[PDB]
From TrEMBL, chain A:
Highest taxon above the source species: Bacteria
Gene3D superfamilies: Phosphoglycerate mutase-like (3.40.50.1240)
Organism: Legionella pneumophila
Keyword Glycoprotein in annotation: yes
Disulfide linkage: 307-312
Keywords: Disulfide bond, Glycoprotein, Hydrolase, Signal
InterPro entries: Acid_Pase_AS, His_Pase_clade-2, His_PPase_superfam, Histidine_acid_phosphatase
Family label: Belongs to the histidine acid phosphatase family.
Recorded GO MF terms: phosphatase activity
Descriptive protein name: Major acid phosphatase
Presence of the UniProt keyword Glycoprotein in the record: yes
Lineage per the UniProt record: Bacteria, Pseudomonadati, Pseudomonadota, Gammaproteobacteria, Legionellales
Amino acid sequence: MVFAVDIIRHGDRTPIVALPTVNYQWQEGLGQLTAEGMQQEYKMGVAFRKKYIEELHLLPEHYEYGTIYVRSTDYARTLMSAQSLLMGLYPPGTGPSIPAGTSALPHAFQPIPVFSAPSKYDEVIIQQVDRKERKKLMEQYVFSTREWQQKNNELKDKYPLWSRLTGINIDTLEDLETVGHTLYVHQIHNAPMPEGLASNDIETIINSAEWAFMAQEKPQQIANVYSSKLMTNIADYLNSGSMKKLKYVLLSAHDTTIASVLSFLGAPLEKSPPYASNVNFSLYDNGANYYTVKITYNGNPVLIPACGGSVCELQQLVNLVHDSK
Amino acid sequence: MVFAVDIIRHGDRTPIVALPTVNYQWQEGLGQLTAEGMQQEYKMGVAFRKKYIEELHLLPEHYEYGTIYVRSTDYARTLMSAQSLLMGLYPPGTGPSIPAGTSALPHAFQPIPVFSAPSKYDEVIIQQVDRKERKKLMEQYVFSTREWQQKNNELKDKYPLWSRLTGINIDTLEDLETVGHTLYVHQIHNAPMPEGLASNDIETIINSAEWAFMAQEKPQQIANVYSSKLMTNIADYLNSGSMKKSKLKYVLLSAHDTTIASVLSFLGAPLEKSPPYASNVNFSLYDNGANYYTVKITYNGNPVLIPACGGSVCELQQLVNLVHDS
């Protein structure tokens, strides 16, 4: 293993939006990484150190300039996720000392830069898409399917009821997604639910929200629009990595990021990426200047139909990404 | 105190441009924050916690989302400076615990997000200025002054020698700036110096580099081009903080010596000396209780004498208008 790229999802977080009908203030603020989420990312970093540094020696024991590049989206939760993980990757005890003295920072913490860009100006991770173009894509590839239509028809009679009880307007199946996600975070943190909302309905809304989310991520043509830039960059990192200084890239991102990438590669999800999810690209030098990339998702090889499995030859992956643009 | 904005300079760093004639490997890499610089920033963060949290209680004891906003330029050295300072502001021991009760991170460290943007897409700190426009500004306001031409004329006989000894081409006084800044970084680390370069000359070059730096930063019209955007944002932050409709209390802007010098020049108070490491320009918003808001501006501990305000204190709208008028 001569090079690796990790995409991560952030750790456990508070809801993105409040339920208007529920009086409950999240101590951390809305949309924020929790203590539990920090520890998840830290633990992942600890595993990354054991794999990348202790076992494979891809990276050195102490942080070294020019060997790693870390990039996050423009959110507190992904920025803090990257800082938390890097605390595991390069833990207190490994940070620099001042010449002829003691450690630079308390407990010899190691600072590591996490670069970023606003979503509107991100040349690496996030692709901006006009609302009109997004709608066209969805109506062409998602809303127009029998499955989406049937699902909405079976549920829509309860949309006025749920709109009332949640305080969030639900006109279409897509609207159910934000509600279900909030209800889900409330559930697993044991927070108060909207009163009057029957428990089976909560199950239906959460499950429907997951289904609709995954259905929107499913079409490869949409993944091509949203993930082409990110995949182009990742291909370029790997390609550059195959040249006999940089050894590791970490991209701190979202569940959309991961689902769209897997869908891009022809392994679309039907179960939303858990917290601290990880898509990994590892580069291998098979001698004779022949390089391969194995792609893994939460520890399981990704079946990429284009490569007949989870191992692509390098230029095959570069061409695959280019062709889908 | 109702609200504060700090602009900081990063801590001690390695040279941006290596001296090609000196065999000396900067282990941190070029243009990077050193261990010494990390500690300088940390210490400043410790002092910021003593002031904003322990004494004034502007900020809470533990980090709270929405009470602070931290923004950095697109450089490892400013990002790491911000991170080191924030280790002082909210130190190990104040970080959160998981539900079970134990520390989320080792030593109860506190993560704090430091936002940024590429220099070409930065709506907050950095103003992009074309090489053509910079040359035009410089020719009009700086390179044409009697003082600039005279200092150049009195040094230039030694430009061929210094070019050879340092391995950096020096044709004009402006070229000397990079070289002097690199010599200065070598000097304050006691790193090796170029073979044959006299101590007298090293001093001349370093001092000339500082002088030229300050001369380029001096004109208010240049500062207007480079710092209008940043100052508009800082006035907007202060103005919003006066309205008491938001939890935001503090903005930290992690930047450069140019950032500092240009802001002060912008306000009509250009520097005569290069900003040291971990320099700090502070804007503090005060409320007299009768809806009268003032902003006191301080640079490395000293009140900034702002001609438009007649001192270091502007009334809020006065400062807003000053910024808008430039």
